[PDB]
Design a protein around this ligand. Sequence first.
Ligand SMILES: [Ca+2]
Ligand SMILES: [Ca+2]
Ligand SMILES: [N+]
Length: 107
Amino acid sequence: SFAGLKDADVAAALAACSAADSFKHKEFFAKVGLASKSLDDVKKAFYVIDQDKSGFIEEDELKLFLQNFSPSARALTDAETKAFLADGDKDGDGMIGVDEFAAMIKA
Ligand SMILES: [Ca+2]
Ligand SMILES: [Ca+2]
Ligand SMILES: [N+]
């Protein structure tokens, strides 16, 4: 709801990644409906996920990614989380900032 996503698109993408190590960020984004929202909307999203309002998604917030979308969802695994940063952390700081986030949702 925070980023204008359908209960339904969210239910379907969580299903697709219900198994540990099955999460693929690119796919999730597209299936949740994220990849077709406006940049404003991509920005609201970044802001909820960054729970502490640090202006960065820290690897502990990343671990809880899916929980943002649905409270009963599973935590991401270490290899899931590693792969996320690996492709989104472009400056090498170990965090995903707003610009790095939008960049990964884009394509
Ligand atoms: Ca944060
Ligand atoms: Ca970074
Ligand atoms: N954090």
